[PDB]
């Protein structure tokens, strides 16, 4: 009934004015189910815009 | 010269250059006084007697 | 501050622990760059990209003959790297506290 997987990814940035450090997170949800014949899994590639 | 930073994150908060050793107007609603005899080394010159 | 450039260069054969971000912060000021072996202090901090932990260490680096700052990643204890790294600063470089 539709499944998903959760992936946490950190990303950091630095401002040029105050000297503080930014460390944020995004959690991607990866889609339901793919795969060849019962071996390990599958996924397609590409690029998208947040 | 005074530099203030947080104790668990380390993000920059403020800095000052003072003469009378009173840190005023950087931490909201509180004024901080630092003793005048902090961080000085004393010696005696006998060739010039000063 | 004053004028000091950028650009880091490797030495072939180094080994990297994992993908992450590294911060190098100054400790003391100097503008006596005219060609001399020397050493000065820095603070280094590492953050990972998969768990977000943070590690803080002390390090040292020195100029050799002109506008180059060579560091040693070997002293990142616990985490652990190998190889060298060279920051191409340039001649007539004044280094203040906080850059």
What burial class does residue C63 get, using C-beta atoms within 10 Å of its C-beta: 0-12 exposed, 13-18 middle, 19+ buried? buried
Whether B8 contacts chain A with CB within 8 A? no
Q: Rounded to an integer, what distance in angstroms lies between the CA atom of residue C99 and that of residue C94?
A: 10
Our CA dihedral for C84, C90, C95, C99, rounded to 10 degrees, sits at -70
Resolution in A: 4.1
C68 DSSP 8-state letter: E
Classify each residue of B8-42 as buried b or exposed e, where b means 16 or more C-beta atoms within 10 Å of its C-beta: eeeebeeeeeeeeeebeeeeeeeeeeeeeeeeeee
CB within 8 A of C24, min separation 6: which ones?
C42, C43, C44, C59, C71
d(CA C60, CA C87): 13
8 Å CB contact between A41 and A28 = no
Interface probe with A: pick from B5, B11, B13, most Cβ of A within 10 Å: B11
């Amino acid at each position: 009934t539709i499944d998903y997987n959760s992936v946490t990814v950190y990303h950091a940035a630095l401002n040029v004015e105050t000297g503080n450090l930014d460390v944020g997170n995004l959690t991607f949800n990866f889609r339901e189910d793919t795969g060849t014949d019962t071996a390990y899994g599958s996924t397609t590639g590409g690029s998208f815009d947040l | 010269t005074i530099k203030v930073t947080d104790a668990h994150t380390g993000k920059f908060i403020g800095s000052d250059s003072v003469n009378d050793s009173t840190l005023r107007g950087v931490i909201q609603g509180v004024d901080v006084k630092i003793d005048s005899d902090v961080g000085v080394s004393i010696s005696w010159n006998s060739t010039k007697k000063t | 501050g004053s004028n000091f450039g950028s650009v880091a260069t490797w030495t072939t054969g180094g080994t990297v622990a994992d993908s992450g971000y590294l911060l190098i912060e100054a400790q003391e000021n100097f503008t006596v760059s005219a060609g001399t072996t020397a050493n000065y202090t820095f603070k280094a901090t590492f953050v990972d990209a998969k768990t977000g932990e943070k590690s803080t260490y002390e390090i040292e680096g020195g100029d050799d003959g002109a506008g180059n700052l060579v560091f040693d990643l070997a002293d990142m204890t616990g985490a652990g790297f190998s190889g060298e790294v060279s920051i191409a600063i340039g001649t007539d470089a004044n280094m203040q506290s906080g850059d």
